[PDB]
Amino acid sequence: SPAVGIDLGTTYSWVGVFQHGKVEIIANDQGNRTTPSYVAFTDTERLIGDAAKNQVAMNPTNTVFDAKRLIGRRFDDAVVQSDMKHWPFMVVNDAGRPKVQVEYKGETKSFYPEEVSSMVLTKMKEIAEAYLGKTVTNAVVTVPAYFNDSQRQATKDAGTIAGLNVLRIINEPTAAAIAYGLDKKGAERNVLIFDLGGGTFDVSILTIEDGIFEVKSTAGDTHLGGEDFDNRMVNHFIAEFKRKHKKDISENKRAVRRLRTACERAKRTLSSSTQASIEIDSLYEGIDFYTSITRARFEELNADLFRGTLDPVEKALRDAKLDKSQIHDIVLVGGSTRIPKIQKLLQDFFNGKELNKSINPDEAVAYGAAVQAAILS
Ligand SMILES: Nc1ncnc2c1ncn2[C@@H]1O[C@H](COP(=O)(O)OP(=O)(O)O)[C@@H](O)[C@H]1O
Ligand SMILES: [Mg+2]
């Protein structure tokens, strides 16, 4: 039976299958290969993915995201209490365990983090069945290497709730290394995984000896990601709109959301183009917002965030007791590592060493998990 590899991402989720000697990162029936890790609840329906993300500004308190930051954790955990101040949805305590509380079809309902993630996994399952034309049951699901047993068990539980048979929970940096065949290359191999996603930055140093993976060190920032770079763009354009129209759009949640979406899309374009256009009809009080931004300006807006990603690299190397010259392979993971300045900074830091980046970095985890799922099935 087909077995799939699932990257259950903090902000975006991906599903691949290894067939015929190739990995297919599977598109949904609108052609999109990624599913935002969003679930929403309304008067009439439950919405997953982009359908949930697209109505977040009209339905903020019943639109849930970031379940991966809660999954496997206890309610009184410092990080849970810290994160809850930034979320517009309610997190309640059920007997020590955090639950998200929403209104759903006119009734108050609460869900464990793994139930929320299972709804995202249900969609991934359906996407893969739409592509394969067959029932999909077996899956390998990835987690951050620092996840503990509770978080791993809760992530497996989300798979089970979704109807998946989770063959194995494996680490995201190991999935990435597997995707590049780094366990099949010789002596010990020191591998640095540089994983910059939508909300989190993870650096891992693995050593692979006789095909055995050992996590030597991890570092990073749990609250640094692409959305911070989008944030800097949003603020930049809110200030521009105010300077040009003497109007502050900050308190119109729908306007800011439309600006944010435009900024995220401009950001992606700036990874392959030196400029990007912003085109928003009726952004605020009937005023269109047609403008542009250069790649240089985007880099300037974020210069300290980009440069600072090197400090967790240095720390991970110090903890692994390796010099930078002892790294055999550098692997780029997460959508944010497509940013040319981040690539330049990292390659410069490694004295010109070529990066592993031929696999779309935001897809490399699902790619590796798909390979592992075929091996185990
Ligand atoms: N071409 C691109 N250039 C810059 N950033 C991108 C590009 N493609 C995706 N991203 C960013 O990658 C981040 C999400 O990465 P991903 O690994 O797909 O999600 P997760 O955060 O769940 O790991 C987002 O901030 C997104 O805007
Ligand atoms: Mg990712």
Side-chain angles (χ1 to χ4, degrees), residues 1-21 23-57 59-75 77-85 87-183 185-187 189-211 213-245 247-252 254-377:
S1 154
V4 294
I6 295 161
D7 171 17
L8 181 60
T10 303
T11 75
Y12 288 94
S13 287
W14 310 78
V15 62
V17 53
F18 176 89
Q19 285 190 320
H20 311 132
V23 174
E24 172 85 6
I25 300 294
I26 302 173
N28 66 22
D29 65 9
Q30 290 82 49
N32 199 327
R33 296 180 132 78
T34 194
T35 305
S37 303
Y38 274 69
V39 180
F41 302 88
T42 86
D43 292 341
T44 64
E45 58 194 337
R46 196 174 63 188
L47 304 171
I48 310 299
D50 266 312
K53 191 163 177 178
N54 293 350
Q55 52 82 78
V56 62
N59 188 31
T61 72
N62 302 308
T63 301
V64 176
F65 59 93
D66 269 8
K68 186 167 175 181
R69 295 182 185 275
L70 295 167
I71 195 168
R73 300 188 185 271
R74 279 227 140 195
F75 176 84
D77 283 341
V79 305
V80 170
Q81 296 299 309
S82 185
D83 283 346
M84 282 165 48
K85 306 182 175 180
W87 290 321
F89 51 80
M90 188 176 318
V91 180
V92 306
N93 190 8
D94 187 338
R97 305 191 50 188
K99 303 189 73 168
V100 183
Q101 177 178 297
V102 295
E103 292 198 345
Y104 179 37
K105 284 163 184 166
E107 301 164 9
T108 297
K109 296 287 176 180
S110 63
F111 298 94
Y112 296 115
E114 55 268 30
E115 301 183 282
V116 180
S117 292
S118 85
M119 305 172 184
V120 169
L121 296 178
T122 294
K123 190 49 152 55
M124 317 290 290
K125 188 182 192 291
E126 291 164 359
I127 287 166
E129 290 171 345
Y131 174 70
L132 296 173
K134 312 183 168 293
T135 290
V136 162
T137 305
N138 292 324
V140 165
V141 183
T142 51
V143 295
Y146 56 84
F147 265 25
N148 65 23
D149 275 353
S150 186
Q151 299 171 294
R152 294 164 189 265
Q153 288 197 1
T155 303
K156 159 159 178 166
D157 288 3
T160 306
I161 290 154
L164 292 164
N165 181 50
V166 178
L167 296 176
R168 193 172 287 180
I169 293 293
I170 74 168
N171 294 327
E172 294 163 2
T174 294
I178 290 177
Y180 280 95
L182 295 181
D183 55 331
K185 285 188 177 174
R189 295 198 76 88
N190 299 316
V191 179
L192 192 141
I193 309 299
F194 182 104
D195 194 339
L196 187 61
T200 69
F201 175 40
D202 283 308
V203 177
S204 315
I205 293 187
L206 315 179
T207 57
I208 322 178
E209 186 153 26
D210 306 321
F213 291 92
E214 162 189 15
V215 184
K216 275 288 186 59
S217 68
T218 65
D221 183 333
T222 56
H223 294 72
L224 173 70
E227 69 188 357
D228 297 285
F229 317 142
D230 307 335
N231 282 0
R232 295 276 180 98
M233 298 174 77
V234 162
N235 290 338
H236 163 80
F237 286 121
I238 291 181
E240 172 179 329
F241 195 91
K242 182 174 194 168
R243 186 181 64 253
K244 169 170 339 194
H245 299 292
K247 290 185 175 194
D248 189 343
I249 71 162
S250 303
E251 306 295 339
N252 184 317
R254 178 174 173 270
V256 176
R257 175 58 61 177
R258 290 174 75 208
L259 178 56
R260 188 177 309 279
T261 297
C263 286
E264 199 198 335
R265 167 177 179 156
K267 176 188 64 174
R268 298 189 181 223
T269 299
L270 292 177
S271 290
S272 61
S273 180
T274 56
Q275 71 289 331
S277 302
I278 301 282
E279 310 181 302
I280 308 168
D281 297 327
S282 200
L283 173 60
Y284 192 77
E285 300 192 345
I287 297 171
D288 300 337
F289 190 44
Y290 279 71
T291 190
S292 67
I293 183 173
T294 65
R295 177 184 292 177
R297 177 60 46 117
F298 170 70
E299 291 168 351
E300 294 155 17
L301 286 172
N302 292 293
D304 54 315
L305 299 183
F306 293 172
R307 176 86 54 194
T309 67
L310 294 174
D311 162 71
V313 170
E314 295 179 331
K315 178 172 150 78
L317 288 161
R318 163 192 326 139
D319 290 347
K321 296 184 183 160
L322 298 173
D323 193 84
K324 63 174 59 168
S325 64
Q326 294 175 287
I327 298 301
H328 293 97
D329 315 281
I330 304 154
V331 177
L332 293 181
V333 182
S336 283
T337 66
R338 297 165 173 262
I339 296 176
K341 189 54 148 81
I342 302 207
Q343 299 189 0
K344 173 190 192 301
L345 283 160
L346 189 57
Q347 181 164 15
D348 288 3
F349 172 91
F350 281 100
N351 197 30
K353 178 169 173 66
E354 294 298 326
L355 311 181
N356 292 282
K357 64 176 188 178
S358 61
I359 300 174
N360 293 328
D362 42 0
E363 300 177 2
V365 173
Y367 190 119
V371 170
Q372 180 77 336
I375 300 166
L376 298 174
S377 68

